[PDB]
């Protein structure tokens, strides 16, 4: 995490901020990661 | 015995030596930079052309001084 | 554009003398130096003004310049940032003044009596920067100040920096002392060559096609003079810090 | 007499010295940069052409100076 | 004879070589720093400008003394 | 006298060192370019021989002129 | 007082009555044969020194050649071995070994030229033997536009053995001149270990000649 902190501090140029550093404008498509229990009987966690 | 001939030759040669070795490193650096990232683009082109014109001026001196001896 | 005429001739010299020699030997450089000092004093008086924390008013420019110089000296070092600050500020705006006034109308032709005779038409401008005596005196003063500061801070350090730098086998001394000694002469010769070269250029290059040839030449010369003044001011502090360090 | 001959030799040699290392650095930088990444091949090729043109300009200046001294 | 002309040729050429090669490395470092942290664009502009200003300061020293020999 | 031989010596000597090392710079640059990425080797092949050809075109200007001096 | 002189002779012409180069070669051969006799008859399963020379010289060179060019080092092993155990030995004998060209009532150009001729014959025999037309490859072929200098490359290869002979004669002769100069002024070598530097330079030159022969063979391979 502090490695990311330092690297983000150094890299400020938007052009050289490529890959996962591109805060792309005009957001169109977004991906989401959902993690759930394998089996039931977990209570209300899966519902939440 | 023809001293002006060697004078003109030396002037032209030692004026023209510089800009080649300059421009080499010049555009090498800029092209490496643009290969790293094409964003700068024209901005680097502009940074390059004036720098090259600076050595073109010395080339002009080298040619002109020989021309004065040549005529 | 065309420059049909105006290219009368070209003539340069090492230096120029002035009048007043009977009461006291005076060269044209002394006249230029006095004028630069008077202009600096007038600027300081105007810069001081009421001095009641007045913003802008053409005094804020001098204040900002002094603050920038102080910040540069502080960044260079802090042991003598206060005591030696006036010493560096003396060179600042004085070497700058010498670089200035070289592009004045007829700066190289001021005090000429007259191309007809030129019997005793010594040009009484002789830019103070364009004089070996002024640069030599300034460099000697700077070297003396650096040596005195080193002796006062670390008297043993100044001697041990060379004699005791490496007692066993060889030592950094002698070579280091010789380099420091050349440093005063080097600084003197730097001011000697600078300004003088600019004047020689403004004469010779403008002698042929004096139309837009002298313009970029004078711009580059002014930038070079300001750079040289700043370089000398910073180099005095750098030598002092190296002596302290 | 012979002074013109050595004058031409000096002119061509001292006009070839510069552009040689010039074009050398030109091509080294260009090949390195295009090796960094494709998709800027056209642009590096255009800058390469600019560089070779600027070096060969001084090359031909020296060459034509020697050629004219030949007559 | 033309030995003074040879002196002018030597002065102009051998004073053009130095700045001519130097400014190349100057602006190459400049464009490299553009390609890596172009945040300093103002700083690199100022610093490359003063560096070249030194280079053609040397060049104009050479040119003016060359004219003096020619004078 | 032997001033024609001096002219040949200058022609062959000067103007050769420039391209002589320029070739080395070219091939070294190509070599690390392909070493970092061998998939661009075809483009490196295209660029190498053309750069070598241009520097050798400077060198052959240096050589054939010396042959002309020899007559 | 400098008194150095050139020992240039004609290999084709009969040997001269003095034959300084021939005498040096004979002495080097005698020393090598003495070492071989000492290491052969008095040889054990794990000899020290006697077999150490073999293990650290012949085996090491064979391993190096195999690493550089395996399965071709075997074919030209005799050539590299002949380049080794010689020239360096002649220089060691000629490194002021109790004579120093004094008390007379590799440096030879002819010998170096003959060695380079042997190297070039090794080329003409083995190199491109696996192809036959390999010498014509990349030389004014259909792709001669990009291989115009290929024949020039062959000429350089023809000039490469000549340069190798020059490098054998050169440096080795230089060492002699430097020793003569030190004798004339500032004798006993010099403040620095002149003699040691000359010996190391000769050994490095012999090793470089052997490696150059192996590399030329490899280049002829491909």
DSSP string, C86-148: HHHHHHTTTHHHHHTTSSSTTTTTTT----S--SS---S---TTS-HHHHHHHHHHHHHHHHH
Q: Distance between CA D25 and CA B23 in Å, rounded?
A: 9
Q: Distance between CA F63 and CA F15 in Å, rounded?
A: 9
Instruction: Kindly tell me the number of DSSP H helices and DSSP E strands found in chain F.
Output: 3, 0
Residues E52, E26: contact at Cβ < 8 Å? yes
Q: Distance between CA G126 and CA G221 in Å, rounded?
A: 9
Residue with structure tokens 């998709």?
Answer: D39
> How far, in whole angstroms, is CA E31 from its chain's centroid?
18
Q: What is the dihedral of CA G148, G152, G153, G156, to 10 degrees?
A: -170
Q: Distance between CA F59 and CA D34 in Å, rounded?
A: 26
Chain B hits for A16, Cβ within 8 Å? 36-37, 39
Q: Distance between CA D33 and CA F33 in Å, rounded?
A: 8
For residue C17, the 8-state DSSP code is B
Which is it for the CA torsion G66, G72, G76, G77, positive or negative?
Answer: positive
For residue F39, the 8-state DSSP code is G
Q: C17 has which bridge partners?
A: C27
3-class state of residue C27 by DSSP: strand
Q: Distance between CA B56 and CA D57 in Å, rounded?
A: 10
Residues E69, E63: contact at Cβ < 8 Å? no
Chain C hits for E68, Cβ within 8 Å? 12, 200, 204
| Tokens found for residue G222 | 């491909």
Chain E hits for B28, Cβ within 8 Å? 28
Q: Which residues of G208-217 are buried (b: 16+ CB within 10 A; e: fewer)?
A: ebbbbbbebb
| Tokens found for residue D49 | 């052409």
3-class state of residue G103 by DSSP: coil
Q: Distance between CA C128 and CA C98 in Å, rounded?
A: 5
List the Cα angle F49/F52/F55 in 5-degree steps.
150
| Tokens found for residue C219 | 């711009």
Q: C210: which residues sit within 8 A by CB, 6+ positions away?
A: C3, C6, C7
Q: Distance between CA D48 and CA B3 in Å, rounded?
A: 39
- What is the secondary structure of G116-166 as a DSSP string? HHHHHHHHHHHTTTTTSGGGGTTSSSTTTTT-TTHHHHHHHHHHHHHHHHH
For residue A44, the 8-state DSSP code is S
A12 touches chain E (CB under 8 A): yes
Q: C27 has which bridge partners?
A: C17
Burial environment of residue G119 by CB neighbours within 10 A (0 to 12, 13 to 18, 19 or more): buried
> How far, in whole angstroms, is CA G144 from its chain's centroid?
35
D66 touches chain F (CB under 8 A): yes
Three-state helix/strand/coil letters over E30-64: HHHHHHCCHHHHHHHHHHHHHHHHHHHHHHHHHHH
Q: What is the CA radius of gyration of chain C?
A: 21
Q: Distance between CA E18 and CA E14 in Å, rounded?
A: 7
Nearest to C126 by CA among C12, C16, C11, C10: C16
For residue A18, the 8-state DSSP code is -
Q: How many C-beta neighbours within 10 Å does residue F54 have?
A: 23
Q: How many CB pairs under 8 A join A and E?
A: 7
Q: Which one of A14, A16, A17 would you mutate to disrupt binding with E, by most E Cβ within 10 Å of its Cβ?
A: A16
Q: Distance between CA G199 and CA G219 in Å, rounded?
A: 30
Exposure on the CB side of residue F36, measured as CA atoms within 13 A: 13
Method: cryo-EM
Q: Distance between CA G73 and CA C85 in Å, rounded?
A: 75
Question: Out of E9, E31, E63, whose CB is closest to B10?
Answer: E9
A16 touches chain B (CB under 8 A): yes
Resolution (A): 3.2
E45 touches chain C (CB under 8 A): no
Alpha carbon of A46: minimum distance to chain E alpha carbons (Å): 47
Residue with structure tokens 């002298």?
Answer: C214
For residue C243, the 8-state DSSP code is H
Q: E51: which residues sit within 8 A by CB, 6+ positions away?
A: E23, E26
* C25 dihedral zone (left: phi>0; alpha: psi -120 to 50; beta): beta
Q: Distance between CA E9 and CA F9 in Å, rounded?
A: 21
Q: Distance between CA G88 and CA G201 in Å, rounded?
A: 10
| Tokens found for residue E33 | 């720093």
Q: Distance between CA D32 and CA G105 in Å, rounded?
A: 65
Q: How many CB pairs under 8 A join D and F?
A: 148
| Tokens found for residue D33 | 């940069």
Residues B16, D61: contact at Cβ < 8 Å? yes
- Nearest residue in A to B39, CA atom: A15
Which is it for the CA torsion C27, C32, C36, C38, positive or negative?
Answer: positive
| Tokens found for residue B62 | 């080298």
Q: Distance between CA F66 and CA F5 in Å, rounded?
A: 9
The runs of H, that is alpha helices, within G2-144 are 20-40, 50-53, 60-68, 77-83, 88-94, 109-126
Q: Which residues of C24-57 are buried (b: 16+ CB within 10 A; e: fewer)?
A: eebbbbbbbbeebeeebeebeeebeeeeeeeeee
Q: C66: which residues sit within 8 A by CB, 6+ positions away?
A: C89
Nearest to C180 by CA among C142, C152, C137: C142
Question: Out of F8, F14, F43, whose CB is closest to D17?
Answer: F14
B33 touches chain E (CB under 8 A): yes
Chain E hits for C193, Cβ within 8 Å? 61
| Tokens found for residue G63 | 């391993």
Question: Is the Cβ pair A16, E39 closer than 8 Å?
Answer: no
List the Cα angle G183/G186/G192 in 5-degree steps.
105
Q: Distance between CA F52 and CA F24 in Å, rounded?
A: 9
């Amino acid at each position: 995490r502090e490695v990311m902190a330092n690297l983000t501090a150094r890299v400020v140029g938007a052009a050289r901020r490529g890959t996962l550093l591109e805060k792309r404008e005009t957001v169109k498509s977004v991906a989401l990661l959902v993690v759930t229990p394998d089996r039931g009987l977990c209570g209300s966690l899966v519902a939440n | 015995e023809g001293l002006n001939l060697v004078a003109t030759a030396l002037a032209v040669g030692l004026g023209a030596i510089g800009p080649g070795v300059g421009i080499g490193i010049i555009v090498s650096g800029a092209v490496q930079a643009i290969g790293r990232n094409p964003e700068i683009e024209n901005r680097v082109v502009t940074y390059m052309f004036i720098g090259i014109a600076f050595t073109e001026a010395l080339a002009i001196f080298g040619l002109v001084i020989a021309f004065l001896i040549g005529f | 554009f065309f420059l049909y005429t105006g290219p009368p001739h070209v003539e340069v010299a090492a230096e120029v003398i002035f009048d007043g020699i009977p009461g006291f030997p005076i060269t044209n450089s002394f006249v230029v130096a006095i004028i630069i000092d008077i202009f600096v004093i007038a600027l300081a008086v105007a810069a001081t003004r009421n001095l009641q924390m007045v913003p802008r008013g053409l005094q804020n420019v001098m204040e900002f310049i002094l603050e920038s110089l102080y910040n540069l000296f502080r960044n260079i070092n802090a042991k003598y940032v206060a005591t030696a600050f006036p010493l560096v500020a003396t060179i600042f705006l004085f070497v700058l003044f010498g670089n200035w006034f070289g592009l004045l109308p007829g700066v190289g032709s001021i005090g000429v009596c007259c191309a007809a005779q030129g019997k005793k038409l010594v040009p009484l401008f002789r830019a103070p920067a364009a004089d070996l005596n002024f640069t030599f005196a300034i460099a000697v003063i700077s070297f003396v100040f650096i040596e005195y500061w080193g002796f006062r801070a670390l008297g043993p350090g100044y001697l041990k920096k060379f004699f005791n730098t490496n007692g066993i086998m060889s030592f950094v001394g002698i070579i280091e002392f010789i380099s420091e000694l050349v440093k005063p002469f080097a600084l003197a010769f730097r001011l000697f060559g600078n300004i003088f070269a600019g004047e020689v250029l403004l004469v010779v290059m403008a002698f042929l096609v004096p139309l837009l040839l002298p313009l970029p030449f004078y711009g580059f010369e002014v930038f070079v003079g300001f750079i040289q003044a700043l370089i000398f001011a910073l180099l005095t502090y750098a030598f002092l810090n190296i002596a302290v360090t």
